[PDB]
Structure formats: structure tokens, C-alpha cells
Design an enzyme around this catalytic site. Structure first.
Site, mmCIF file in Angstrom:
data_model
loop_
_atom_site.group_PDB
_atom_site.id
_atom_site.type_symbol
_atom_site.label_atom_id
_atom_site.label_comp_id
_atom_site.label_asym_id
_atom_site.label_seq_id
_atom_site.Cartn_x
_atom_site.Cartn_y
_atom_site.Cartn_z
ATOM 1 N N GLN B 105 28.090 41.714 43.405
ATOM 2 C CA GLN B 105 27.825 40.544 42.523
ATOM 3 C C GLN B 105 26.818 40.930 41.444
ATOM 4 O OE1 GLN B 105 25.844 36.994 44.179
ATOM 5 N NE2 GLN B 105 27.223 35.788 42.874
ATOM 6 N N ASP B 110 26.181 42.322 35.532
ATOM 7 C CA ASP B 110 25.834 43.313 34.482
ATOM 8 C C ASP B 110 27.018 43.431 33.510
ATOM 9 O OD1 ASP B 110 25.225 45.745 33.004
ATOM 10 O OD2 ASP B 110 23.763 46.255 34.564
ATOM 11 N N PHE B 186 28.861 47.665 29.118
ATOM 12 C CA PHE B 186 28.164 48.868 29.681
ATOM 13 C C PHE B 186 27.336 48.469 30.912
ATOM 14 C CE2 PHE B 186 28.335 49.559 24.984
ATOM 15 C CZ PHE B 186 29.345 50.495 24.989
ATOM 16 N N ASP B 188 24.206 48.661 32.250
ATOM 17 C CA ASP B 188 22.976 48.900 31.443
ATOM 18 C C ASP B 188 21.829 47.946 31.803
ATOM 19 O OD1 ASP B 188 24.111 46.521 30.565
ATOM 20 O OD2 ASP B 188 24.093 47.086 28.417
ATOM 21 N N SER B 190 21.701 44.811 31.756
ATOM 22 C CA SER B 190 21.685 43.631 30.848
ATOM 23 C C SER B 190 21.360 42.351 31.631
ATOM 24 C CB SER B 190 22.975 43.480 30.093
ATOM 25 O OG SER B 190 24.056 43.950 30.871
ATOM 26 N N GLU B 258 22.275 31.438 41.062
ATOM 27 C CA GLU B 258 23.546 30.883 41.603
ATOM 28 C C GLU B 258 23.497 30.804 43.131
ATOM 29 O OE1 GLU B 258 26.127 32.564 43.455
ATOM 30 O OE2 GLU B 258 27.614 30.931 43.356
ATOM 31 N N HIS B 351 34.503 37.580 46.567
ATOM 32 C CA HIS B 351 34.477 36.185 47.082
ATOM 33 C C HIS B 351 34.912 36.155 48.549
ATOM 34 C CE1 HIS B 351 34.219 34.596 42.722
ATOM 35 N NE2 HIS B 351 33.052 35.071 43.186
HETATM 36 C C1 MH0 Z 1 31.704 41.644 44.303
HETATM 37 C C2 MH0 Z 1 31.784 40.803 43.290
HETATM 38 C C3 MH0 Z 1 31.360 39.383 43.388
HETATM 39 C C4 MH0 Z 1 30.690 38.767 44.426
HETATM 40 C C5 MH0 Z 1 30.149 39.419 45.673
HETATM 41 C C6 MH0 Z 1 30.568 37.418 44.096
HETATM 42 C C7 MH0 Z 1 29.942 36.473 44.867
HETATM 43 C C8 MH0 Z 1 29.802 35.144 44.531
HETATM 44 N N1 MH0 Z 1 30.336 34.471 43.514
HETATM 45 FE FE1 MH0 Z 1 31.575 35.321 42.050
HETATM 46 N N2 MH0 Z 1 31.157 37.167 42.925
HETATM 47 C C9 MH0 Z 1 31.662 38.348 42.446
HETATM 48 C C10 MH0 Z 1 32.366 38.542 41.269
HETATM 49 C C11 MH0 Z 1 32.624 37.518 40.361
HETATM 50 C C12 MH0 Z 1 33.209 37.774 39.046
HETATM 51 C C13 MH0 Z 1 33.670 39.046 38.417
HETATM 52 C C14 MH0 Z 1 33.292 36.612 38.406
HETATM 53 C C15 MH0 Z 1 33.840 36.420 36.985
HETATM 54 C C16 MH0 Z 1 32.657 36.477 36.004
HETATM 55 C C17 MH0 Z 1 33.002 36.332 34.522
HETATM 56 O O1 MH0 Z 1 32.840 35.232 33.933
HETATM 57 O O2 MH0 Z 1 33.419 37.308 33.848
HETATM 58 C C18 MH0 Z 1 32.736 35.619 39.364
HETATM 59 N N3 MH0 Z 1 32.355 36.195 40.518
HETATM 60 C C19 MH0 Z 1 32.663 34.284 39.025
HETATM 61 C C20 MH0 Z 1 32.038 33.367 39.819
HETATM 62 C C21 MH0 Z 1 31.983 31.997 39.506
HETATM 63 C C22 MH0 Z 1 32.599 31.300 38.302
HETATM 64 C C23 MH0 Z 1 34.060 31.001 38.678
HETATM 65 C C24 MH0 Z 1 34.864 30.446 37.510
HETATM 66 O O3 MH0 Z 1 34.439 29.441 36.915
HETATM 67 O O4 MH0 Z 1 35.943 30.971 37.105
HETATM 68 C C25 MH0 Z 1 31.294 31.408 40.495
HETATM 69 C C26 MH0 Z 1 31.002 29.929 40.565
HETATM 70 C C27 MH0 Z 1 30.917 32.410 41.435
HETATM 71 N N4 MH0 Z 1 31.429 33.601 41.019
HETATM 72 C C28 MH0 Z 1 30.203 32.211 42.626
HETATM 73 C C29 MH0 Z 1 29.894 33.220 43.543
HETATM 74 C C30 MH0 Z 1 29.047 33.038 44.697
HETATM 75 C C31 MH0 Z 1 28.392 31.748 45.143
HETATM 76 C C32 MH0 Z 1 28.972 34.251 45.351
HETATM 77 C C33 MH0 Z 1 28.241 34.703 46.559
HETATM 78 C C34 MH0 Z 1 27.351 33.970 47.218
HETATM 79 CA CA LIG Z 2 26.008 45.187 30.899
#
Ligand code: MH0
Ligand SMILES: [Ca+2]
Ligand code: MH0
Ligand SMILES: *[C@@H]1O[C@H](CO)[C@@H](O[C@@H]2O[C@H](CO)[C@@H](O[C@@H]3O[C@H](CO)[C@@H](O)[C@H](O)[C@@H]3O)[C@H](O)[C@H]2NC(C)=O)[C@H](O)[C@H]1NC(C)=O
Ligand SMILES: *[C@@H]1O[C@H](CO)[C@@H](O[C@@H]2O[C@H](CO)[C@@H](O[C@@H]3O[C@H](CO)[C@@H](O)[C@H](O)[C@@H]3O)[C@H](O)[C@H]2NC(C)=O)[C@H](O)[C@H]1NC(C)=O
Ligand SMILES: *[C@@H]1O[C@H](CO)[C@@H](O)[C@H](O)[C@H]1NC(C)=O
Ligand SMILES: *[C@@H]1O[C@H](CO)[C@@H](O)[C@H](O)[C@H]1NC(C)=O
Ligand SMILES: *[C@@H]1O[C@H](CO)[C@@H](O)[C@H](O)[C@H]1NC(C)=O
Ligand SMILES: *[C@@H]1O[C@H](CO)[C@@H](O)[C@H](O)[C@H]1NC(C)=O
Ligand SMILES: *[C@@H]1O[C@H](CO)[C@@H](O)[C@H](O)[C@H]1NC(C)=O
Ligand SMILES: *[C@@H]1O[C@H](CO)[C@@H](O)[C@H](O)[C@H]1NC(C)=O
Ligand SMILES: [Ca+2]
Ligand SMILES: [Cl-]
Lengths: 595, 595
Positions: B105, B110, B186, B188, B190, B258, B351
Site C-alpha cells: 500500500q 508513491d 517514479f 521517489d 513522493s 486512510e 485488497h
Molecule cells: C498492495 C496494494 C494495496 C494495498 C495493500 C491496499 C490496501 C488498502 N486499500 Fe487500496 N491498497 C492497495 C492498492 C490500491 C491501489 C493501487 C489503489 C488505486 C489508487 C489510485 O487511485 O491510483 C487503491 N488501493 C485504492 C484504494 C481506494 C480507492 C478505491 C476507489 O475509489 O477506486 C481505497 C478506498 C482503498 N484503496 C482502501 C484501502 C484500505 C483500507 C487498505 C488496507 C487497510
Molecule cells: Ca512517486
């Protein structure tokens, strides 16, 4: 149809409160209520809407139904019997230049636009209305009265489509129809930059970091910039001369190419933004694209405000200036900045100031080429006469050296607009702007003359003799009563414009009130007003006081001789001086070293 | 279109080419094409957008319209019938720590963020979407299927807002709708420093010339730093317990608070920058604020890169590591560094790795206080449980000693995320992250499962039996077919995550391909990659190899016992050793005398 049920904020709101710059959309100006003055919202109501059925149907919709007992007369019958005249001789305004007319229209387009219900959806409901003159939904045809010359020439009607309007909203409350204002209610150069960020982005030179507005890449006016061409089809500017096949200009406002001198004024304003950007680049080389654009935009924004309030409105409102727009006492955040429905009809006083011809003048302000003087009706959606006939300089000299038409109770609207108006989606030079105005008042559920007389604490004539008194004209009053039966029923546009002009002004007491009130409100209610402390420095405000339309021309054309006061009637050469003698906009106070 | 011209908002900053430091925005990384990988641009497309109307509208927008003949099933119905489970027993991953989940996450944030069209929380259109479930513009509601328990409890829908998109930020489409990546593509740090210079400045201690990041001035964790408080209201972190009234933390990334363990990881990273700055101050007293910040930033930047590529990706990609991320052959400036639209859904494999509880553990890694084990849903936007309940140390011990959830075809997403997710603008612990993922794939005009199978040169099943074969699960395949009718229609997120995991990895072959390709590109395409000759000295790179998450904890907490490899399952006490025994970051090679 029911186009735009609502209306909910297309661009949403991103109120970055530490930002010193206006939003494109006019959002976040008023902090209490962010949507006040923003684009694509309901026109304010100063009085409640008045419809045939209390809701949406305009007065004159149903043959049977009447207004305060009496039938409403056909728009076109009012146009023919009151607004028409044949003889263009002696009609010109002896103490106002054509720039007076043109600046009115520039300001109007910054402030308000209520575009037709946007969808045909690839449909012949557009032609069904035009071709078969069938009243229904958004088709609200202007029916020709008996003996109308256009019966022989154009059929039974002119097409007319009702203005777009806001929600059936979730409560699904019984509500009056409210028309939308697609532009920012603030005087903010939105006609240059756009009232929506899609357009505003599309209008910028972003492939360069210089905060420049995009310029034409196909043609040039002796090395000076034109607006880009709107390549979106079908182009009405190409339609009017298919051989020249020159498109309309793409500008911050949809209507930029509506007539040649409007397109011209849009060209001056664009050149001035780019001139400001490359002058701020010299003074601040470290400043990036966004910063140059926004500061240039802010300066131009203030230019329009100053010319409008210092030079323009005093000669519109005359004796009523101080009554309605007193000296400035600072930003009052409890004033409604929104443009009212009624203002959009009040400001159409401009229509009676448009003369029948546009002149191109050479370097000695003499007729330019063989065909110097062109009839106005040939210059609707005409961009080719600029690109392929001399640029904007001959046209700009025309604006300084020729006169606006004078409002005249016996000669109200030139047949160039009253019979030969061109509408962008139809084929003929055959429409009536005055008829459209009267029809549009009804469409917008406008209260009557006396309702607005009342609203302005002015007398409410109920009789021929009482009307004769207010209009100081017996034959005009008689004609109005024969048609409307009561002054209560007189459509606001013809009512306000029938009133004799006030001392040193160019509108009647009623329009002075309506215009004055709105202009007071868009100043007082604007958090980015130029005189509001903190918007500009005291240094910057001292330098902004020197600006003039004369200077705008000097800096943005190849014209060298201009008059000191461009809005009054100026004849060459007595009233003209050299550009070197005119005060400049000293940009030193914008110089930001050690930033 | 405005194609070859289309461009959205951005700071438009120029390139100081002799600068040896990354820009905040990621601008000027690629010299040929300066905008590649920069913040606030279009997500790259590996395959073309697929919309209902070929432009902007997502599949599932119009009830009527279908996809390859078959209707698209409600996101929530897919969630309930496939992604849900009741039994949290035996679901934990026996060979991965919770830090495995958490690091995923951190990396994700980043790399990519596609924020909703930013609602000001000052409108009726926010509640109009939520309250009345009215699809239109950016309101794209997740509709409940019949018999869904939330009908009784939450109404007809969960509110859902469409991701922002480029040039027109409000709706205009001729080229396909492209969503924005608001952060630097990147790797980095951020998420620590920001992807925009206004924020990045605001996050620094500038009133001290020590290049320190601003720290909390209201609270302390036994003398160790917390992130400052986000003063921007309304704060959802104080909403979740109004008595505690503890705000969200202010970080380089919008999403820092979050969930509590993300905020925790953000706390470690911040402490490490400040620890780096005051160690480089000792070694180089003559170095000023800018130089300390930038070098600290560069080191931390490299830490994240090394832990990600050396420790993290090998246990994600397993058998596919060497195929997609081979040994490094240096900076290839012709590789696209930008994060793809599809990656942002690929990386949401995370997720299914989030377990139902977060534990606080004491100095003996025993339950801390009576309420040691907290259900995950209580820790969304929860900063008070840190400030007012033990600091981050008990939570960090939890990360080392507790297990990540294992992805499981019969147990995909815990109800803590699938039923009880909290969204920052809404009031209820009632949202479904899985449903939001499926809805969001459609919003982003994602091509289908087979489209991406194809893109990865893997078989494209067209039948129940063919799908059964790929998923090595009959009941899962049957459920997917009953809902999607064709594997062509299966949303990428559920399709990738349905695939049995690859040997000694934690994703299927399809995600291995998608994740592998993107990770290869952000390394190879980065001019400031840590291994790229000339970014660091050979001496500095020798010292950077010793870094470890175990060391990060030791240097930045009051934890003394940590395991040698934090990402593996490590039980107390056998697998833990003393902090003194772990290799250090020797900063001697940064010593820059006689400058
Ligand atoms: C290993 C990766 C990873 C983990 C672990 C992870 C763990 C979690 N997540 Fe979640 N999350 C991950 C990768 C993402 C991505 C890549 C995105 C898309 C972001 C973007 O806008 O480009 C994401 N999660 C997006 C989200 C979003 C937005 C969803 C949407 O509106 O489309 C929420 C609310 C979120 N997550 C919650 C959480 C919570 C709560 C946890 C853990 C407690
Ligand atoms: Ca970055
Ligand atoms: C000083 C003011 C002013 C001047 C001058 C002016 C000059 C002109 N006009 Fe016209 N015009 C002015 C103020 C307006 C307003 C305020 C509106 C209503 C705009 C809105 O929708 O809110 C308007 N004119 C509206 C219009 C409309 C739309 C009418 C309708 O559909 O209801 C047309 C076609 C038009 N004009 C043409 C022109 C032309 C052509 C000229 C000059 C050659
Ligand atoms: C966006 O802005 C850039 C520059 O800020 C514009 O490119 C520039 O365009 C001008 C023409 O307007 C070029 O100057 C020309 O040089 C030739 C060669 O001697 C000469 O024939 C012309 O008289 C003119 O001086 C110039 O090459 C170029 N500048 C740069 C830095 O590239 C671009 O046209 C603008 N685009 C829009 C849409 O406005
Ligand atoms: C539990 O998790 C760990 C993840 O670190 C796994 O242990 C590792 O298993 C991998 C297989 O993917 C082993 O790789 C091997 O490395 C040796 C190098 O000496 C090489 O000879 C082999 O060809 C292979 O590449 C690795 O040795 C091993 N590492 C450690 C520290 O034990 C393990 O596979 C996981 N167990 C289960 C049941 O999933
Ligand atoms: C015209 O008006 C201007 C200012 O409005 C005034 O100064 C001038 O005396 C007037 N001249 C004529 C000829 O009407
Ligand atoms: C149309 O354009 C051509 C030049 O492009 C011009 O010579 C001609 O006069 C124009 N026709 C009309 C009707 O004005
Ligand atoms: C602002 O305008 C209102 C009228 O709407 C007036 O009553 C009030 O006095 C004004 N406020 C100030 C501070 O002058
Ligand atoms: C600034 O630096 C000083 C000493 O280095 C420190 O006490 C202070 O907390 C820093 N400021 C902030 C707001 O973090
Ligand atoms: C809310 O916060 C207080 C500390 O301010 C804590 O003692 C209490 O248990 C919390 N209550 C809930 C309902 O989370
Ligand atoms: C560099 O990039 C391109 C891929 O776009 C590729 O053709 C070339 O082989 C690459 N070089 C190396 C060393 O991988
Ligand atoms: Ca405006
Ligand atoms: Cl993609």
C-alpha cells in the site's frame, strides 16, 4: 425534450481560499455561498417568473388564454408597427462613436448568455419547427401577422427555440421555469478565457511555457495575431460565403463571430493578453506558464472593469449614474453578484444603437479600397472580410471615426437586424431580432413594464394619457395601447426602450434603474473587483488608472492616430492625436524580483 | 480534435538540467519528453479505453446497453456472490507478515492516485447523488441488487464519483476519457515529500536551516515525532470519534490516514528523513537547508526502491521475477516511465491481503492493554488510537508478528472492507471496496479479462470449461459465468485476482505480467534510479545495500527486538534478535569536506 433537467455543478467546486486568482467558472467568489455568480446556473430573479400556466408556458402560448384580461399581440406585429423604419438618413448618434455600441455587446457577452435547449440529437424537430411552424415543447414559433411582407417570401413563421432551464430537482417541487446563464456573472474577461475549463484549457498555448493564448496558425494581420479557427462543422461563417470558406473564430464566448466588429474587439482583447504575457516574461523571467496566464488574465479582467465603469456606464446612465452606481465603498459579501433574468433584456438597449453599415477606413481615415461601406447584414458570421480583406485595422478605424445609431422612438431597430438577421443554424438572411426579443421576454416568463416600473419606484401608467406622459409621444403611446390594451401587458424590452433617454445618458429612467442596479451588484458583490483592497497593490491600482481603449488600439494594431476619448464622436483629424501622446500601462509595479 | 494539443492543468515548470535532484512533480526526469512520469497527467494506456459510447460513459452506465451482447452485472452483486465470506478462520497467510500487505500500500501510494472530481462539501449535488441515487455526470452510483441486506440499512445505492480526467476537467469527449495520475509515476518517496511544490514546501521545517520535515507540535510518541495535523475541515479522522477530536495527519500523499498502519508507516518514513538530515548535519556542518533536505530525500527515495525491488517484488512475482524484472542494464531513456491505467487495478491485489484485525503488542510481543486486537473497520481514518493509545510501537510490533491475509478463491475480501469501509466524505461504516473496484474499472474504461489475458500472451477462455481450467476452480468459474456470461466481460480486477497464485508468488500469471511490466518500466525509465551510474557514488551504493525495514524500525521507534527479514512470518522470540545486531546505514560516504 426537457433538455438539462438539472443543472447540478458540472465542474463541481475546488475552493482553494489562499488562491489570489478567479476560477474560470466564477465558483468560490462568494465564500458563504460558493455557486453565486458561477457559470451554468439559474439566472437570478428580482421578481417571480410570470407564465401563462404559472409554471413554464409563456404568455402568448395558447390562442385562447389572455394576460390581465387582454390578448398579448404577436411579437412580429409589435416589431412591424412600432420598431420598424425605412429611412436610415439622420438616424446616427451625433455624440457617440460605433465603439460605444460595440463595447456594450463585449460587456453583455462577458456577463450573460442563455443558449437554446442544446439537443436536436441528429433530429428534424429543428426543421419540424422551422418548416411546418408547429408550436410544441421547445419549438415556440414567431407567427407572421396578416399583410406581413415575409408571408410571400418566408412562409407562416420564423423558427424560435426556448432558452435552456434548470431542474426538476429531487423534491420534484412545483417550480417556475428558470433559464440558465452559461457564462460568469462577474465582469472577468470570461468572453476571452471561457466560462468552463474544457474551453479555457483549449484556448491556451500550453505547448509553450509563456502563458500565451493560442493564436491562428493559418493567417496573420501584418504580423499581428488572429484568434484560432473553430473547425467544428457545420460552420455558419463558411456558409455565408462558401467560396471564401473561412471558419468562425474560437473564443472564450460562443458568439464571438456573430458580426465582424465583435470578432474584431475579441481580436484586440486576445492580442492584449499575449502582449501582457510577453511583457511580464521580460520583467519576471523566473515566472512559469500558469503565473503569466493568470496575471495577464487578472490585468485584462481589470481593464474591462475600468473601461466599463469609468468610461462606458457614465454615458449610458448619464444623470442616474451617481443614484445607482455611487462611489465604491468596498466588497459587500451579502450582495447577490448573479445576473438577473431581466438584465439580459434591459442590456438589449444595444440593439437600437446598431446602424445599417460598417466602414473600413485607410491610414488617413478615408474609405479603404473600392467597397469601404458594407451593409451590416452581410457581416453576420463574416470572418473572411477580416482574413481576406485588410485585417482589423481598417475596421478599428471605423469604430473610432463612425457613429453608433441613436435610439429614436420613430426609428428603433434597423432592417439589417429587424428583417435581414442571420441565425447560425438556418439558411436565410430573413430573421427579426426585435421580434426574437419580444418572443424571448415571454419565453423567460418576464413580468410586464409596470411590474418593473413598480420595482424601480416609478409611476405605473394605466391609461393612454398616462403612457403619453411617460413616453412624451402621443402616436407611440396610442400604437402601444392598440396592441397591448394595458401598459401592464407591454413586454419589458419594448417598454424600457420606448422611454425617452435621460439627461446626458443613452437609456430611459426604467433601464437606468435596471442596468444601474445590476452593475452596482456585479461590482459590490465581486470579491476580485479591481478596487477591492488586496486584489491589486496600491502601486498596481495607480498604474491601472492610466488604461484607455485608445491605448489598447495603439498597443495591439498598426493604427498610430486615435482620439483621447474613444466613446464620444471623434472626426479625423482634429479630434485625433499620435499614439506617443497617450498614457501607457506601466507594468513596473508587477516586477517581482527576490520572489 | 484538440488532439496533439489536448492538455489539462499542471504547474508547467521549466528544466534546470544541471540539477542532480528529482523535481517534486517528476518533471525533467526524461530530457527528450520532460512531462513523462510527472504528476497531474493522463495515466498511460497499454490498451485503448473501452467505453459504452466509445468516448467517456462506462459499461453499466445505461441499463439498456450491453457488452459483447450480454448485460454487465451490478458491481455489488459480483461482490456478494463471489468476493464475500463469513469465516475469518484459517484465512491468514502463514508465510507473510502484515508488513507485506502494508508495504504494498505504501508503494502503491508513491506510484499512483486517480482522485475523484474534487467535491468541496458545500453543494446539494454531493447529497443528491448519495440521498436520491440519481446517475448523471460524475455521480455513478453502485446500485444494490434485490435482497441485499444494505437495502434495509442504507437505501438503494452506495454513492460513487467518477475519477477526474485530462484537458476538459468537466465533460467534453472526442478522444477517449483519460484519468489523471495526481502523483509521480517514479518510485521517489513522493508520498513523504508531495507531488506538488506548494504542499512539498508546506511539509518542510523551513524556519530552521536543517532541511527538516515539519513534525507535530501538539503531541509526541515518548519523545519521537508524529506527522503534523491536517487543519483542513471537515476532518473525517475527528468525525469517527468526535470526543477524541484528533485530526488526520498531513503527508506528501492525500491518503496517509486512510487506516492506522498506513499512517504508522508514513510516521516511520518521516522520522527517517529527519534522522538522515541531523546525521548529514554532523557529517557536513557547512551544508544548508535545501542541500540537507534534498540529500535526505534522495537517500529515503533509494531506501523505498531497494526494499521494493530486493525484498518485496520477489515474494509478489515469485517464479516470474527474473522474466519481467531481470538484472539492471542501466537507464534506458526511451522506456515509458508513466504508470498505466491497468496497473492501478492490478496493484489492488493488496485488497485481498488485508485481514479483519490489527493487534497492538507490548515489549514482550504480548497483547497490549485489554483491547489489543481491534477490528479493521474501526481503524479507517483513525489517528486517535495512535495519539491517545500507546503511539506507533505496539502497532509496529503487530506488523512484524501478525500475518497478512492470504488471497483465497473462496475468501477474497474481508467484510471489514467489503461491508464496513468508511469513505472520508460520507457518515457511515457501510461501503464495499470490492464493489467500488469493479465500478472503478468501468469508470476507467478498462478492457476486459481476455483483452488483458491477450496483452500478456496467455490463453483467452470463451467457455465455462475453459475458465474452470484457468482458475482450477469449477464453482468460481460457474459463478463468474452466471454473472458475466462471457469471460470477455469479466472486470480486470476480479479476473486477475481469481487466478491461482504462481509458484512462491502472491499473484496469478496475469497480474505477474501486468505488475512485472510496470515495475520493469519505473526502474529502467527512471534517470534518478539508485543503481544508475552517477546518481550515487560507488561508495554510497555499497552503503545503501545494507538498508532493511528491520533497521528502519530500530532507528525510528523504541522497539529493540526485530527479525532479520521483516516480510517473512516471524514468531517471538526465536525469529527476533537485538537491534544492535542488524547492519546499519553507514553515512560516512556522504561526508563532503572542503566544499
Ligand atoms: C498492495 C496494494 C494495496 C494495498 C495493500 C491496499 C490496501 C488498502 N486499500 Fe487500496 N491498497 C492497495 C492498492 C490500491 C491501489 C493501487 C489503489 C488505486 C489508487 C489510485 O487511485 O491510483 C487503491 N488501493 C485504492 C484504494 C481506494 C480507492 C478505491 C476507489 O475509489 O477506486 C481505497 C478506498 C482503498 N484503496 C482502501 C484501502 C484500505 C483500507 C487498505 C488496507 C487497510
Ligand atoms: Ca512517486
Ligand atoms: C449593448 C448591448 C448589445 C449590443 C450592442 C448588441 C448587439 C447585437 N446583438 Fe444582441 N447586443 C447587445 C446585447 C444583447 C444581450 C444582453 C442579449 C441577451 C444575451 C443573453 O442570452 O443573455 C443579446 N444581445 C442577444 C442577442 C441575440 C440572441 C437573441 C435571442 O435569441 O433571444 C442575437 C441574435 C443578438 N443579440 C444579435 C446582436 C447583433 C448582431 C448585434 C450587433 C450587430
Ligand atoms: C505557442 O507559442 C510558441 C512560442 O511561444 C509558438 O511557436 C513560435 O511561433 C512563432 C510564429 O508565431 C515562430 O517565430 C517565427 O520565426 C520564423 C522564422 O524566421 C518567421 O518566419 C516568423 O515571422 C516568426 O517570427 C517561432 O518559431 C516559434 N517559437 C518557438 C519558441 O518555438 C507557437 O506557434 C504558439 N502556438 C499557438 C497555438 O499559439
Ligand atoms: C516461505 O517464504 C520464503 C520467502 O522468502 C520461501 O523461502 C525461500 O524459498 C525460495 C523459493 O521461491 C527459495 O529460493 C531458492 O534460493 C536458493 C538459493 O540458495 C536456490 O538454490 C533455489 O533455486 C531457489 O531459488 C529460498 O532459498 C527460500 N529462502 C529462505 C530464506 O528460506 C519459502 O519458499 C516459503 N515457503 C512456502 C511453503 O511457501
Ligand atoms: C459629448 O459628450 C461628452 C461627454 O459625454 C461631452 O464632454 C461633450 O461636450 C459632448 N459633445 C457633443 C457635441 O455633444
Ligand atoms: C465571397 O468571397 C470572394 C473572395 O473570397 C469575394 O471575391 C466575393 O465578393 C464574395 N462573395 C460575396 C457574396 O460577397
Ligand atoms: C451590504 O448591502 C446590504 C443590502 O443588501 C446593506 O443592507 C448593508 O448595509 C451592506 N453592508 C455593509 C457592511 O455596508
Ligand atoms: C524546526 O527546527 C527546530 C530545531 O531543528 C525544531 O525545534 C522545530 O520543531 C522545527 N519546526 C517544525 C514546525 O517542525
Ligand atoms: C473515543 O475517544 C476516547 C478518547 O478521547 C476514548 O477513551 C473512547 O473510548 C473512544 N470511544 C469510541 C466510541 O471509540
Ligand atoms: C531500450 O528501450 C527499447 C524499448 O522501448 C528497446 O527496443 C531497447 O532494446 C531497450 N534497450 C535495452 C538495453 O533494453
Ligand atoms: Ca463574466
Ligand atoms: Cl491501461
Amino acid at each position: 425534450s426537457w433538455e438539462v433537467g438539472c443543472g447540478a455543478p458540472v465542474p463541481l467546486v475546488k475552493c482553494d481560499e489562499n488562491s489570489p486568482y478567479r476560477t474560470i467558472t466564477g465558483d468560490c467568489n462568494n465564500r458563504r455561498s460558493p455557486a453565486l455568480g458561477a457559470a451554468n446556473r439559474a439566472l437570478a430573479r428580482w421578481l417571480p417568473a410570470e407564465y401563462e400556466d404559472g409554471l413554464a408556458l409563456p404568455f402568448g402560448w395558447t390562442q385562447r388564454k389572455t394576460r390581465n384580461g387582454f390578448r398579448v399581440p404577436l411579437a412580429r406585429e409589435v416589431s412591424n408597427k412600432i420598431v420598424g423604419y425605412l429611412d436610415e438618413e439622420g438616424v446616427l448618434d451625433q455624440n457617440r462613436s460605433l465603439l460605444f455600441m460595440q463595447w456594450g455587446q463585449i460587456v453583455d457577452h462577458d456577463l450573460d448568455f442563455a443558449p437554446e435547449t442544446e439537443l436536436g440529437s441528429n433530429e428534424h424537430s429543428k426543421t419540424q419547427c422551422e418548416e411546418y411552424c408547429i408550436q410544441g415543447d421547445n419549438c415556440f414559433p414567431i407567427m407572421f401577422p396578416k399583410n406581413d411582407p415575409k408571408l410571400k417570401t418566408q412562409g407562416k413563421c420564423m423558427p424560435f427555440f426556448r432558452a435552456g432551464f434548470v431542474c426538476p430537482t429531487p423534491p420534484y417541487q412545483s417550480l417556475a421555469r428558470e433559464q440558465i446563464n452559461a457564462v460568469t456573472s462577474f465582469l472577468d474577461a470570461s468572453l476571452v478565457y471561457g466560462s468552463e475549463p474544457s474551453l479555457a484549457s483549449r484556448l491556451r498555448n500550453l505547448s509553450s511555457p509563456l502563458g500565451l493564448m493560442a493564436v491562428n496558425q493559418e493567417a496573420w494581420d501584418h504580423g499581428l495575431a488572429y484568434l484560432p479557427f473553430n473547425n467544428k462543422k457545420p460552420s455558419p461563417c463558411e456558409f455565408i460565403n462558401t467560396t471564401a470558406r473561412v471558419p468562425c473564430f474560437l473564443a472564450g464566448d460562443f458568439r464571438a463571430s456573430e458580426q465582424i466588429l465583435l470578432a474584431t474587439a475579441h481580436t484586440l482583447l486576445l492580442r492584449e493578453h499575449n502582449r501582457l504575457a510577453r511583457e511580464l516574461k521580460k520583467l519576471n523571467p523566473h515566472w512559469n506558464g500558469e503565473k503569466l496566464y493568470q496575471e495577464a488574465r487578472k490585468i485584462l479582467g481589470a481593464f474591462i472593469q475600468i473601461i466599463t465603469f469609468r468610461d462606458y456606464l457614465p454615458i449610458v446612465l448619464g444623470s442616474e449614474m451617481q443614484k445607482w452606481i455611487p462611489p465604491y465603498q468596498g466588497y459587500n459579501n451579502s450582495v447577490d453578484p448573479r445576473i438577473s433574468n431581466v438584465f439580459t433584456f434591459a442590456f438589449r438597449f444595444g440593439h437600437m444603437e446598431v446602424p445599417s453599415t460598417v466602414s473600413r477606413l485607410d491610414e488617413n481615415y478615408q474609405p479603404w479600397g473600392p467597397e469601404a461601406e458594407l451593409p451590416l447584414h452581410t457581416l453576420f458570421f463574416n470572418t473572411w472580410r477580416i482574413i481576406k480583406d485588410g485585417g482589423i485595422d481598417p475596421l478599428v478605424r471605423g469604430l473610432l471615426a463612425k457613429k453608433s445609431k441613436l435610439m429614436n422612438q420613430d426609428k428603433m431597430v434597423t432592417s439589417e437586424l429587424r428583417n435581414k438577421l442571420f441565425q447560425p443554424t438556418h439558411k436565410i438572411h430573413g430573421f427579426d431580432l426585435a421580434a426574437i426579443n419580444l418572443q424571448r421576454c415571454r419565453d423567460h416568463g418576464m413580468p410586464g413594464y409596470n411590474s418593473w416600473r413598480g420595482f424601480c419606484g416609478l409611476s405605473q401608467p394605466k391609461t393612454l394619457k398616462g403612457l403619453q406622459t411617460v413616453l412624451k409621444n402621443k402616436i407611440l403611446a396610442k400604437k402601444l395601447m392598440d396592441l397591448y390594451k394595458t401598459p401592464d401587458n407591454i413586454d419589458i424590452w419594448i417598454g424600457g426602450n420606448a422611454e425617452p433617454m435621460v439627461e446626458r445618458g443613452r437609456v430611459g429612467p426604467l433601464l437606468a434603474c435596471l442596468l444601474g442596479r445590476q452593475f452596482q451588484q456585479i461590482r459590490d458583490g465581486d470579491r476580485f473587483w479591481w478596487e477591492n483592497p488586496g486584489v491589486f497593490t496600491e502601486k498596481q491600482r495607480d498604474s491601472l488608472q492610466k488604461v484607455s481603449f485608445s491605448r489598447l488600439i495603439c498597443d495591439n494594431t498598426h493604427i498610430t492616430k486615435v482620439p483621447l476619448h474613444a466613446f464620444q464622436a471623434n472626426n479625423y483629424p482634429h479630434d485625433f492625436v499620435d499614439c506617443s501622446t497617450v498614457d501607457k500601462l506601466d507594468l513596473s509595479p508587477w516586477a517581482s524580483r527576490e520572489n
